[PDB]
Amino acid sequence: QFRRTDDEVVLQCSATVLKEQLKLCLAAEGFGNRLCFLEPTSNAQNVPPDLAICCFTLEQSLSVRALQEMLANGHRTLLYGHAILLRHAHSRMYLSCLTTSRKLAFDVGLQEDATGEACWWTMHPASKQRSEGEKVRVGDDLILVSVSSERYLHLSTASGELQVDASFMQTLWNMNPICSCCEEGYVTGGHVLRLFHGDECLTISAADSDDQRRLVYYEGGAVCTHARSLWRLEPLRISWSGSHLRWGQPLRIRHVTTGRYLALTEDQGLVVVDACKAHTKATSFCFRVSKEKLRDVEGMGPPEIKYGESLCFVQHVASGLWLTYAALKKKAILHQEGHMDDALFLTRCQQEESQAARMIHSTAGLYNQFIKGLDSFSGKPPAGPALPIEAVILSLQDLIGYFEPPSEELQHEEKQSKLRSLRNRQSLFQEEGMLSLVLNCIDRLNVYTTAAHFAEYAGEEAAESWKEIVNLLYELLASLIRGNR
Incomplete structure (x- = not known):
């Protein structure tokens, strides 16, 4: 209290x-x-x-x-x-x-x-x-x-x-x-994590995939270390949302980088859905000890579900359908009866990786809208909503320092450890198609010979930052590609 x-x-x-x-x-x-x-x-x-x-x-x-x-x-x-x-x-x-x-x-x-x-x-x-x-x-x-x-x-x-x-x-x-205070090694709400099957974990397709990134799979190999396999557990309560997860307690499962919500839908089936279309009935899941038939506290509550050690069947609440597969990558589906081996176990994501997944989400969304602003006035010389000039510059500057290599003067031991982090930070962005994303900004920007030429198609006010943004984009591009070994 x-x-x-x-x-x-x-x-x-x-x-x-x-x-x-x-x-x-x-x-x-x-x-x-x-x-x-x-x-x-x-x-x-x-x-x-x-x-x-x-x-x-x-x-x-x-x-x-x-x-x-x-x-x-x-x-x-x-x-x-x-x-x-x-x-x-x-x-x-x-x-x-x-x-x-x-x-x-x-x-x-x-x-x-x-x-x-x-x-x-x-x-x-x-x-x-x-x-x-x-x-x-x-x-x-x-x-x-x-x-x-x-x-x-x-x-x-x-x-x-x-x-x-x-x-x-x-x-x-x-x-x-x-x-x-949280019980050590117990699953709480708001935790970012992976769900493992059996190795194979629950994920969506990689960037620019024919999926449109809406479908859910069980996939093995490298995904298990990629940002696309990360989910955030969200209970249906703003307060004590970070409390221990309880068997049978309803929650939403959010895909971190894409920001969409695991849902059951009328037409498509088991998919991932936009925040706006994520109503309770469609998007509420819970963990079940078993598949047998079957009041909320105000504290951290009883710790019930252990990371790694607990096997959980995922169930859609409204329909009572089981999260299962279709008979490497397999498609995730919801099924009345499912499979004898549906139980997943949970591994907690670490903070560096978790942070990076979210940074991807924001950056993707920001540059994507900045691109939509450029596409809007490509042939028009405006009604186009203001370009996020101020935010893009800062976003670029922030990621540049984020990917900056360690000073050469640092000791060997510290250098090594800092380099591994840098390489892995880079890896996560690359696997989410941040390179292409940066490249598209450059390509669309470069259609223009200079600031004045750009100004012809965009506000003179926007043109004052054109050289800076182009320079910042190249710098980021370089910072992403750099090997740091």
Whole structure:
């Protein structure tokens, strides 16, 4: 009931939309975009929210005396009046108050390093029900104050869209628990993992495949180490979603890089589906101890399912159909009776790989839309929606540093270990067709002789970044191909 450090939390606030309360979570991508935005979580029943980038970890919780002291030089409970540090689970960046605007208001984004006063936030009570120095409890409304700027974490409404900023105005914030202390080696929600059969694991086809990437297979060999075989387990509850998985408990199974949802469909059968089409009935699965006929807690719950050691039959909830195969790669199907050997076991993905899979997802989506912007005005000299110039430049810069080789001056032992990581990071991107993706940007950009020629077909404003983006694309291309052996 108390909040302790190292808890995983989301910062939730609420807003009234056409006479109804939409709940919203604080979210940022980090790479390609530092700025926070708000993720609607109210329509979960029909459209699963992008929860992965909403998760923060409570790194440290400090007093004024404690904070002022650290700036000059395991489970502490959160007390009102404490300053907290929130690390972004995906980007490993810290929630901070920036120095940019759009009113006298700062932006709320992510910071590369927990340096200076900018990434610290003090907590204050919503009412006379709680007081400064008291344990911060579940369900409490919080006011959060930027240490650097003395401003409040604030929900904004301008002109029409929901947004976050730092304002002189105040916003009531709920800090919802995702997960707490976890039983070692047990499956919890929000874990990214692979599902093994028997070696063979559950996957979708590789990039630019005739599939359109919609179909599910059991495949062997190299896939088992490729990003396409990774899934995120998502229970149908925003709070305590990161709690232990329980047999028979319904969940959604999300493909990380593609961002689509394992589903049973009327026409196609067992497939992978867009977030928007992922309604509960279509997309709810559970693990079953066996295929025999056959109230939710508020904590981490009982640990039931062990990584590697537990064999699980996957079942579609609405239909009671079994996840099985058709009689190397085999097609995954849903079948009334299935096969005597349907039971899968689960292996937890590691953080570096897991992070990389998500980075692929964002990058693919970003550059794909940047391409759609170019295709739109190819023969037209605009109505075409603004190109994500600002985001592309940062996305490019971020990946370049991400793939940068280690300094030659580093010791041999450290070099070797750092090189293996680099090579593997590269490997994952390459297998997802990031090279072709970068190449298409270059090819479509290069149709143009210069900036002015580009400007003829695109805004003069867009043209000011054409040489930079082309140079950044080549640099990334080079960084991806480099052998680093």
